[PDB]
């Protein structure tokens, strides 16, 4: 019964997980039981999503966030994002949920039964937070494992089925990506892409070649960064640049996760390659360009002269120019002219949209996909009424893209706050004034006046 | 003792009248760039075509605005989310037309107010303070993150950012309720619970401390001189204020702990405005407020209108009238 009141730890009940900072066996069971919770939710939600699953309806019309992730991997989906076998979804639900009891056993074991600290039973597993080479050894072990995980995705993409390609010919199909981009000027040229419009930093990855080869590059620098951090100790420039505390590494991870949640929010909102609109629905960009296309289609079918047709303002109602000069979709969707989907690349020639490819060359699957993507925009309410805020309660639709971007913005902002909390605290803790100011040695009364 | 260790002795020094810090080596030149460009755009910027449809909106003072109607008008919808620096444009007059000054101000303001937050950390670390005044400033800063950057990103254009203007703000609020039903969003309702509570608990704490000041002065001079700065005695009786406020409601509704009191004063508006900034940041991706349009229907199926159906007609009023010429299509997608 150490670190379990505020008499022994100096941490209250609402910061009672901070009583486990120097309890390596108990902090391990904290993390394995929590790992069991993520793998439980991965399991139980996938089962909940597949028990309440209609394979007639598209995935975005069903409030599904996890079945689209298994479907993106190339499991149980065929031509155009259509489910032909729900058993690869069910196995992912069962292998996760059953594995959660093993991590639930081992989380409960190390937390409430095992040795409270690992520093006695196993010097290999026993760690001090301020032991810098051990803290890279666990970092090197976890880097190789994420290098193993980023090579499993390459394995599923290159050997074990291929991933779903939105840019497959003739519509979307699961495609074995056999020639991935190994070129580092393309892989790391994504890193030097601007985040802003038309460039879209790494969210603009628009083919499964750079995805697989980028995960060969990430998957092997994480292995080679694991072998780096296993075989080395931190260098002297880094020892003076970091707080070496348990809460410090937490804050560095929290700040890293705030980056990742803000990026994955942007991936699910803008990218329709690694988040195919077959499964996740049209993007915000995708639905506004689909609306301009549907009425480009409808009115030219009534014989409108859509290139010369004017808006109220002088601009093209259907076809105006981007500020770089490309023929783009008229209307307010001029903000979304940097959008690339596969239902309108047969329109895009080298000047932007080709007017002669609009007149006698728009296929009925494109009219179908644009009308579907317009009426399934990622606009919706919190009670899941589809449409605008002024829409009536008939359409039970919020996109998974809206659910995924907003949840991973709520989480990613708080993880920035949690980084600011824990980075401020862990540097206040390593300097010795997180509990307050000493009255006998208050720094400001020893600090000179201002004016 | 080169001029680097002499440079870090100035940047990190608490002896500066205004603390610089390393975050302030970003904060000062960004926020001076965001302040010089703001007041120039507020007085002398020629009208910005915000909606990309060649209808310019006058924002500056020289073009027939006052301070209330003055604004820096957001960047053009033709630009969208595109990075529009001065060197993107062919001339200044093109950069002024398409709302480039707005992108200059908000990219220097947000990068400089993010670095205000870490500068607030940095002085707390130089002074030996506990560090979380930065965390409390993350509540107005996320709000500035949301309406300047995040709501443009979700909506796909810096024309949807909040205009740097008093009445441009009111344009942003009206259009937001028309499209996202922000009043029916509970995160905005927790934010109103954060600012109404924040103003309550300010006037509460302000009046219970002022109620409980020990007599140190005469009624012929101000009671403010009972405090001398740096004194060790507490200037008000915390037991009397708890005795007052505890008898006011009931004893256990009352923070008789000054530290537990000021955590609550810290946390209630901050978690309030956190959730409200999360309101704007989630209605960036069109996760709109609660849509109870035609929810109560009778046995025949006739829609029995509610108060949320009266809001829906007001919401319809703003949305069919916002940017009267920008829409060529019936659905307002983004």
């Amino acid at each position: 019964a150490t670190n379990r009141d505020q008499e022994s730890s100096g941490f209250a009940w609402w910061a009672g997980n901070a009583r486990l900072i120097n309890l390596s066996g108990k902090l391990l069971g904290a993390h394995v039981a929590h790992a069991g919770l993520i793998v439980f939710w991965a399991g139980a939600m996938t089962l909940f999503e597949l028990a309440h699953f209609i394979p007639e309806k598209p995935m975005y019309e069903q409030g599904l966030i996890l079945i689209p992730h298994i479907a993106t991997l190339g499991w149980g989906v065929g031509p155009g994002g259509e489910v032909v076998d729900t058993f690869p979804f069910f196995v992912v639900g069962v292998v996760h949920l059953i594995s959660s009891a093993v991590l639930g056993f081992g989380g409960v074991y190390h937390a409430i039964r095992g040795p409270e600290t690992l520093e006695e039973y196993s010097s290999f597993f026993g760690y001090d937070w301020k032991d810098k080479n051990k803290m890279t050894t666990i970092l090197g072990f976890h880097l190789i494992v994420l290098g193993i995980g980023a090579l499993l995705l390459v394995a599923k993409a290159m050997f074990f089925g291929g991933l779903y390609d939105t840019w497959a010919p003739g519509g979307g199909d699961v495609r074995v990506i056999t020639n991935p981009t190994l070129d580092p000027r393309v892989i790391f040229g994504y890193l030097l892409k601007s985040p802003f419009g038309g460039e879209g930093w790494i969210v603009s990855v628009n083919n499964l070649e750079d995805v697989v080869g980028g995960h060969i590059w990430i998957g092997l620098i994480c292995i080679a960064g694991g072998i780096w951090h296993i075989l080395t100790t931190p260098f002297g420039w880094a020892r003076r640049a970091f707080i070496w505390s348990g809460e410090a590494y937490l804050s560095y991870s929290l700040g890293a996760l705030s980056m990742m949640g803000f990026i994955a929010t942007c991936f699910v909102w803008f990218n329709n390659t690694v988040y195919p609109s077959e499964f996740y629905g049209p993007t915000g960009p995708e639905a506004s360009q689909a609306q301009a296309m549907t009425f480009l289609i409808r009115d030219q079918k009534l014989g409108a002269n859509v290139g010369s047709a004017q808006g109220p303002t002088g601009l093209g109602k259907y076809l105006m120019r981007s500020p770089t000069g490309e023929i783009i979709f008229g209307g307010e969707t001029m903000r979304f002219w940097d959008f690339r989907g596969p239902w309108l690349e047969p329109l895009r020639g080298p000047n932007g949209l080709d007017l002669n490819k609009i007149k006698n060359d728009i296929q009925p699957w494109q009219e179908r996909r644009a009308a579907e993507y317009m009426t399934h925009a990622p606009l919706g309410s919190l009670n899941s009424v589809g449409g605008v805020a002024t829409e009536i309660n008939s359409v039970n639709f919020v996109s998974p893209r809206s659910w995924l971007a907003t949840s991973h913005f709520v989480l990613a902002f708080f993880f920035l706050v949690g980084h600011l909390w824990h980075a401020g605290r862990a540097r206040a803790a390593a300097a010795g004034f997180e509990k307050g100011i000493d009255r006998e040695s208050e720094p400001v009364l020893s600090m000179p006046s201002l004016d | 003792a080169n001029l680097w260790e002499r440079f870090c002795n100035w940047v990190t020094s608490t002896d500066n009248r205004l603390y610089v810090g390393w975050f302030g080596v970003i904060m000062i030149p960004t926020l001076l760039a965001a302040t010089i460009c703001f007041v120039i755009a507020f007085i002398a910027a020629p009208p910005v075509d915000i909606d990309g449809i060649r209808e310019p909106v006058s924002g500056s003072l020289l073009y027939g605005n006052n301070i209330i109607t003055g604004a820096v008008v957001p960047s053009s919808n033709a630009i969208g989310l595109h990075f529009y620096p001065i060197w993107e444009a062919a001339s200044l007059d093109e950069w002024l037309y398409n709302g480039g000054p707005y992108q200059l101000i908000i990219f220097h303001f947000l990068l400089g107010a993010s670095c205000y937050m870490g500068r607030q950390w940095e002085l707390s670390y130089r002074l030996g303070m506990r560090p979380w005044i930065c965390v409390a400033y993350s509540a107005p800063l996320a709000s500035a993150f949301a309406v300047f950057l995040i709501y443009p990103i979700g909506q796909g254009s810096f024309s949807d950012g909040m205009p740097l203007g008093i009445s441009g703000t009111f344009n942003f609020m009206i259009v937001f309720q028309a499209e996202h039903n922000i009043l029916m969003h509970p995160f905005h309702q927790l934010g109103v619970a954060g600012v109404f509570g924040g103003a309550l608990f300010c006037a509460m704490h302000g009046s219970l401390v002022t109620s409980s000041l020990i007599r140190e002065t005469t009624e012929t001079e101000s009671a403010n001189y009972g405090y001398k700065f740096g004194q060790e005695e507490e200037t008000y009786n915390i037991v009397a204020a708890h005795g007052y406020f505890g008898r006011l409601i009931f004893q256990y509704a009352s923070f008789n702990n000054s530290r537990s009191l000021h955590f609550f004063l810290a946390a209630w508006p901050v978690v309030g405005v956190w959730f409200a900034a999360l309101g704007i940041s989630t209605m960036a991706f069109n996760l709109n407020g609660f849509n109870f349009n035609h929810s109560v229907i009778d046995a025949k199926g006739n829609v029995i209108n509610t108060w949320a159906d009266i809001i829906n007609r007001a919401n319809l009023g703003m949305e069919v009238m916002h940017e009267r010429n920008a829409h060529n299509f019936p659905l307002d997608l983004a």
């Binding site: 004016d451 | 006052n66 001398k228 700065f229 740096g230």
Partner: peptide
């Protein structure tokens, strides 16, 4: 007459400059 009245704001910056750098200082008492 309009804008040059509003440019009241220049008095605010001078007050912002005076109340920061030329305030009667806090005295440790």
């Amino acid at each position: 007459m309009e804008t040059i009245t509003y440019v009241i704001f220049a008095c605010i910056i001078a007050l912002f400059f005076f109340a920061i750098f030329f305030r009667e200082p806090p005295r440790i008492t």
